[PDB]
Design a protein around this nucleic acid. Sequence first.
RNA 1: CGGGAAACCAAAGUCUUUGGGUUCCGGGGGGAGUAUGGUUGCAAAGCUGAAACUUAAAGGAAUUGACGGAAGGGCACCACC
Lengths: 226, 83, 207, 126, 99, 25, 129
Amino acid sequence: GKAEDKEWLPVTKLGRLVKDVKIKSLEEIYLFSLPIKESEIIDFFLGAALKDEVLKIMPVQKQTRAAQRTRFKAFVAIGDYNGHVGLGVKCSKEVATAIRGAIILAKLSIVPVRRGYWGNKIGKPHTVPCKVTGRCGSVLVHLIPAPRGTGIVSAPVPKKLLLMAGIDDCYTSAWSCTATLGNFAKATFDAISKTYSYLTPDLWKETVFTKSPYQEFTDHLVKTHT
Amino acid sequence: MQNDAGEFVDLYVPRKCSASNRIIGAKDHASIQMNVAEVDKVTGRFNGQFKTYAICGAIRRMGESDDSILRLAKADGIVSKNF
Amino acid sequence: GALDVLQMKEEDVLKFLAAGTHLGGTNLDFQMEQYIYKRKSDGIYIINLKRTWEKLLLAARAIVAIENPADVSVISSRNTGQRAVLKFAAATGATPIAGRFTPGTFTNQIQAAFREPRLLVVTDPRADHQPLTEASYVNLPTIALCNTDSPLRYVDIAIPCNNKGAHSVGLMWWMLAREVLRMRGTISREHPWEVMPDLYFYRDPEE
Amino acid sequence: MGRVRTKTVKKAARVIIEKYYTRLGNDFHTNKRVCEEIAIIPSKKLRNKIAGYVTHLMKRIQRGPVRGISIKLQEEERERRDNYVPEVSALDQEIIEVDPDTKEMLKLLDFGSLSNLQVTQPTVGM
Amino acid sequence: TKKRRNNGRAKKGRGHVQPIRCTNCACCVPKDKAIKKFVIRNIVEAAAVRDISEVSVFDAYVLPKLYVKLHYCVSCAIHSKVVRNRSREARKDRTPPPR
Amino acid sequence: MRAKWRKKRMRRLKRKRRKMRQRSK
Amino acid sequence: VRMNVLADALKSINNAEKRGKRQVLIRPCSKVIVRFLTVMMKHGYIGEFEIIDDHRAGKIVVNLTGRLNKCGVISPRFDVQLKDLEKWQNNLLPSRQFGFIVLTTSAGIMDHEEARRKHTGGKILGFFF
RNA sequence: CGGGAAACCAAAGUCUUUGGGUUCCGGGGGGAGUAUGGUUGCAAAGCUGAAACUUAAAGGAAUUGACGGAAGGGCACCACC
């Protein structure tokens, strides 16, 4: 049918505020490090700019008295090519439900990505800010800054996540069992995620505090709301 | 982060732990922001003014946040440098 | 604080001495040691009574700093605190929970009991361990009443006291309700209060 | 043999007692008539089983509380153990003794002057 | 993989410990691997005591105890039901059974 | 105990081969 | 046995920084340790420090500010020439924008950026970032 | 604490943010601790020690089943008294 409103009504304090008042970006949700549990919050802020990618579909099974019982597991990545990326996984009895479930978890997992410069500071930033790494299982992944216009030097799996994150130039390295695509994807997303929590000399000045959104809008949640 | 024209280029600037001087990440759901009331000096009553602190999740789970909040409240005037 | 209008009076010190609040256990955890006066000749620790009043005023200054009183949540799963948390939540408009806490009340968004508070107060860290460990998923600050052998693992204000049972638990909740009502402006800092401490105590022999 | 009652019987009996406690009693043949007019029950054989467990529950409720059931008559006397008791007209009075190390702790806090004192044993009790 | 932290033996801070011979089968095993049982009982059973007290020559006598100490290997202790196998977390409990 | 018996089997074969060759010259 | 004192001093600071402690005690003291600490302090990575006399080599107490990611030692004191210094800072540093190698030279103990202004080579001691 | 494939380990930690000193020693599974030379011993034997040829896996930790002349509860005249 026709796409009218009221397909969503909030079930959390953050959802009640995002639908109504001047919460103006995801960055003021990240600043207070709040959990996101309604998928419609990220469609409100990023929306149709997000593009979607199925990395692998994988069968898994358990033994029973009668037969082997099979489920399908889908790996999905999502991003806007300008500083946001997410990864998600679900396992179901049918492939179409596994993909549809994986997209919701890939939206709830989105993080902010930091970018910087290899050389002199001309224009806008285009590479990782410093040498970083991430782990999952035995797999280790490592990212290194590069001069302007090299592109990404990597295997296929890490290249697709770095492209969706909006990084132009990068040198990369890996170790142990990369043939397991799930641990290779999570080790890459762990390295990308750490870029905004590495203490660097431009972040050394003293922090200035403000009230949180639940404190600024403390009466809006009471006077006409439940 | 600034470029050679002097303009800023970060998405946002993240907060740091008041006890420890380390960055609090976007998914650190064990972290907190504490808020504490000031009182007037003639009658011990709330005037609507307040002070705030932020604590890292790693310092909370090792049990050090109670002593950290106390040191911060003695460094500010609230506990008045005697005990 | 230093101020005379916030100083501990003789009549409060006699009420502490009368209820056993200053008497700890036979054991001490290394995080509680700064709250202790001495160990007796019989193996029992003495809690320092001036340390309690500073930490209780710091807790009241956190509770007053919340602009909607229903955003504060109050808990006791042991019986000795159940009458006390019900009276505390009547005197000032917090949300009480008494008896069994259901796992997932703070994190299962769909659940019939689901709630999302701004401050959490608990009667005993070892007994009330579910809402303490569950607060670590949702950015929720914590206040607790601690004995000499209490494990400090998620509490941000610990108040030194005997929390074993009887008159000592009820007195602490009554005195916390008195000072939050005083410094918010609802009762006098000099005239005695109309609510007797004995209203908060648990089940002395009735007849 | 087996005479255990299934959850369809046990839940319907509790919901009847919560709403209609003032109509009910110890006579099975009167309870059997009440349960037929306050509820729609598809079978005569199910109606007899529900009125049977209702008759068992009334004889329990006459002795004390049943954890799944609540009534005004039992809540208002709980509310009378709540509020204040008839036990005493004043608190247990603050005239209590002090040990020498608590006397020293109070001396450093600028207080005392209202308590008697005595010493403990010569060596730690075994 | 290793099943027990103590290797199933009491030996720590030592090289060699002397053997003993079992009370059922005379197998040879270390004094600190062997499963212990010290039994104290009456010479006369709880059924028989009344029949032997009434034929006694004395106006007061108390029937004596019998003392025996027993040693088993793992195979005899399991087969004679002196010990049972246990759950992976229950194996850690060192407290003896209740009375 | 198959490895200990394969070790014993090799020792008796080597004792035969020893005595056979050292007789020749 | 204790074959090198500068490696103890930096490993002791590095373990204290990771536990979140506000002070650390270094023992034994040395002329090399006091000159290395001074280079970190001048660039803003540690607070001020105090030396205790005991008639047996002495001790140092240092104040920590939470900014330091790592400090470390290269054990053989390899020689470096100005043409080869690029290879060492490509190996050891996290970015071209921050962090320092520390060298000993006949003009003194110094920062690898100062050795280029003074046109001098030397031996490697360690690094920080 | 932190580490690891995990079982587990206050060391088996302070490691891609990789350098305290120093000795012995491993390189897919077999043929093989074999043949041949040397050497020590009364003898049994110890020490040192190959190649031709052959092969797609051999192996470690853990999960769900099935199975036991393993243990503990309970049941059935298509089981027994």
